[PDB]
Design an enzyme around this catalytic site. Structure first.
Site, PDB file in Angstrom:
ATOM      1  N   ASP A  89      51.291-113.721  27.065  1.00  0.00           N
ATOM      2  CA  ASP A  89      52.641-112.886  27.215  1.00  0.00           C
ATOM      3  C   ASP A  89      52.498-112.051  26.243  1.00  0.00           C
ATOM      4  OD1 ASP A  89      55.627-113.383  28.347  1.00  0.00           O
ATOM      5  OD2 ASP A  89      53.886-114.565  28.798  1.00  0.00           O
ATOM      6  N   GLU A 145      52.366-105.442  35.259  1.00  0.00           N
ATOM      7  CA  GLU A 145      51.921-106.887  34.905  1.00  0.00           C
ATOM      8  C   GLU A 145      50.354-106.873  34.648  1.00  0.00           C
ATOM      9  OE1 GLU A 145      55.755-108.270  34.403  1.00  0.00           O
ATOM     10  OE2 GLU A 145      53.685-108.960  33.793  1.00  0.00           O
ATOM     11  N   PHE A 203      62.111-109.919  37.359  1.00  0.00           N
ATOM     12  CA  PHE A 203      60.783-110.449  37.499  1.00  0.00           C
ATOM     13  C   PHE A 203      60.377-110.559  35.982  1.00  0.00           C
ATOM     14  CE2 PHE A 203      56.873-111.145  39.711  1.00  0.00           C
ATOM     15  CZ  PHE A 203      55.888-111.126  38.690  1.00  0.00           C
ATOM     16  N   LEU A 251      54.454-116.541  34.469  1.00  0.00           N
ATOM     17  CA  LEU A 251      54.781-117.305  33.294  1.00  0.00           C
ATOM     18  C   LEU A 251      54.465-118.953  33.760  1.00  0.00           C
ATOM     19  CD1 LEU A 251      55.888-117.744  30.573  1.00  0.00           C
ATOM     20  CD2 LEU A 251      57.786-118.445  31.659  1.00  0.00           C
ATOM     21  N   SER A 277      75.554-101.747  31.448  1.00  0.00           N
ATOM     22  CA  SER A 277      74.440-100.754  32.021  1.00  0.00           C
ATOM     23  C   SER A 277      74.494-101.208  33.580  1.00  0.00           C
ATOM     24  CB  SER A 277      72.862-101.146  31.992  1.00  0.00           C
ATOM     25  OG  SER A 277      72.817-101.210  30.359  1.00  0.00           O
ATOM     26  N   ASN A 279      71.848 -96.226  27.876  1.00  0.00           N
ATOM     27  CA  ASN A 279      72.394 -97.631  27.459  1.00  0.00           C
ATOM     28  C   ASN A 279      71.360 -98.869  27.638  1.00  0.00           C
ATOM     29  OD1 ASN A 279      73.986-100.441  28.566  1.00  0.00           O
ATOM     30  ND2 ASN A 279      75.197 -99.182  26.680  1.00  0.00           N
TER      31      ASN A 279
END
Length: 164
Positions: free
Chosen positions: A20, A11, A104, A32, A117, A132
């Site tokens: 973003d 991040e 997250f 965010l 998945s 996948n």
């Protein structure tokens, strides 16, 4: 390596409101603020989040505090989620970090949508699940990061993050 170090690689750290990969207003370590197009709506959410008048800028300290809350909430969301919990419980410590990372980035909801998945990860079919997971908007939009997370689920080791 741990969840905090891992997420902080993915991040980054920015002390000024920023956008973003998605164009959304964010601050700190991937916190965010709003999906709304006004910097003003973002500033307001920021002040609400910190408890002061920030004027769009925070300290390292405030960034880490938000990060601690976000991680805690991600884990707790996994634990409260009927689709996520069983997968999480089935995984080893390293792979648990990879699922936390996805939650997250994309929220409980978004991850809970990767039905097939999840099923494969529960079954411990690592190679299949990695193939996948790659078939997703997530991988196509943020390939280097998806690839790190995916390697983590594939191997159960921290190799992808050694480089970094």
């Amino acid at each position: 390596m741990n969840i905090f170090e891992m997420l902080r690689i993915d991040e980054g750290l920015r002390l000024k409101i920023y956008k973003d990969t998605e164009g959304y207003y964010t601050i700190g370590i991937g916190h965010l603020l709003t999906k709304s197009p006004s910097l003003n709506a973002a500033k307001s959410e920021l002040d609400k989040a910190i408890g002061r008048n920030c004027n769009g800028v925070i300290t390292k300290d405030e960034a880490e505090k938000l990060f601690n809350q976000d991680v805690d909430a991600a884990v707790r969301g996994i634990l409260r989620n009927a689709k996520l919990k069983p997968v999480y419980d089935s995984l080893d410590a390293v792979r648990r970090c990879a699922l936390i990372n996805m939650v997250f980035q994309m929220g409980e909801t978004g991850v809970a949508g990767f039905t097939n998945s999840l099923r494969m990860l529960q079954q411990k079919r690592w190679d299949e699940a990695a193939v996948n997971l790659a078939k997703s908007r997530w991988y196509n939009q943020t390939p280097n990061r998806a690839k790190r997370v995916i390697t983590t689920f594939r191997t159960g080791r921290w190799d992808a993050y050694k480089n970094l």
